[PDB]
Amino acid sequence: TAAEIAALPRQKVELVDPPFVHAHSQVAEGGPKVVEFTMVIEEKKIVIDDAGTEVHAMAFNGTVPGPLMVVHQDDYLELTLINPETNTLMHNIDFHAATGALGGGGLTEINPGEKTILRFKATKPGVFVYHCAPPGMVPWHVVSGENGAIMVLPREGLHDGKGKALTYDKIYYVGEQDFYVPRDENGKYKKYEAPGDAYEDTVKVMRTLTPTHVVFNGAVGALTGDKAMTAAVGEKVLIVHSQANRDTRPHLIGGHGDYVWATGKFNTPPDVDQETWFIPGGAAGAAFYTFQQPGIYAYVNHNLIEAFELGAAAHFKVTGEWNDDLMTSVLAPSGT
């Protein structure tokens, strides 16, 4: 508890752009420590589709979603947040993992040219959303990309229902984002000089509750082809997914969610053998799967219109040998 006791081991961590996850250990290597992270909020224009649609994003570390921070239950997460003097807005941060002052948002308001340091004890294990929440403009900052997630691993690592340890070989972080880009009378998306010039039009669109794009990792096709996530037959993978503003229903086409903490909380036992899971807006979830077959797999939001029309689909390229017991073409497409 005491302020003198918090002078515990400190550990500076360097973050790695979504979606790889910075280095960490699944089983806590020692006792509680103060884990240090630094993030800069960047207001910048990004292209969200193959047709050149520009968006004035508000991005932690320049990415959409912001990076995944990983700590263990009972460690203290100390974050240094910086708001560049070139930015035009005040920003703060709300960790769903934190207890108090609006997720930390009440203690972190910084205008262009300032920085602040917030520390909180990660008391609850699970994956949680974090995002900017400026008074009067909460929705707008969040739907501009300003959100991400953190993982508070139990000190002894992950397990299933009856305490059986679940260790993953790889971990990926998929941040799903809903964008509301305005259009002109000609149906062509609009461009603006500064973020603020877009506020009014953007809000008229937000109110319809219908996004124009729904993307993984900031852009349509951001995680496909050359940027496809990878694994091999036999590897245990954990996929952390988050949606700060609206619902999503992840589905691994060709596979399943062997263990899924749909609510993202590790003290709540995982659902098993899932085909499609549900993550409500404002939450993060995690699914663990062991690959059985090689090939490409499509990871999508199972509202297939959002997946294939709006932009919410990613690829997994898996290597290994085919298993004919699991599945096999008895008669390939042939004339009748």
**For Cu ion, which residue of 141, 246, 256, 265 counts as binding (CB under 5 A)?**
141
- Only segment of 4-12, 16-24, 29-37, 132-140 that touches Cu ion (CB under 5 A): 132-140
Q: Residue 81: name the closest of 52, 124, 49, 110 by CA.
A: 110
Nearer to Cu ion, 96 or 121 (CB): 96
Residues 125-154 that bind a copy of itself (CB under 8 A): 125-126, 128-129, 133, 138-139, 142-143
The total of other beta-carbon atoms located within 10 Å of residue 302's CB is 16
Q: Which is nearer to Cu ion, 211 or 255 (CB)?
A: 255
29 binds, among a copy of itself, Cu ion, none (CB under 5 to 8 A by kind): none
Contact 260, 274 (CB under 8 A): yes
Residues 258-297 that bind a copy of itself (CB under 8 A): 263-268, 271-278, 280-284, 292-293, 295-297
Q: Compute the radius of gyration of the chain from its Cα atoms.
A: 21
| Element holding 283 (H helix, E strand) | strand 283-290
Q: Which of 25, 86, 319, 323 binds a copy of itself (CB under 8 A)?
A: 323
- How far is the CA of 229 from the CAs of 93, 277, 298, in angstroms? 29, 20, 10
Q: Reduce the secondary structure of 208-219 to three states and give it as a string.
A: CCCCCEEEECCC
- Residue 244 corresponds to which tokens in the numbers above? 């700060």
Minimum CB separation of residue 296 from Cu ion in Å reads: 15
Binder of a copy of itself out of 107, 166, 228, 232 (CB under 8 A): 107
Amino acid letter, residue 97: A
Q: Which is nearer to Cu ion, 91 or 241 (CB)?
A: 91
Residues 35-64 that bind Cu ion (CB under 5 A): 58
Contact between 229 and 327 under an 8 Å Cβ cutoff? The reply is no
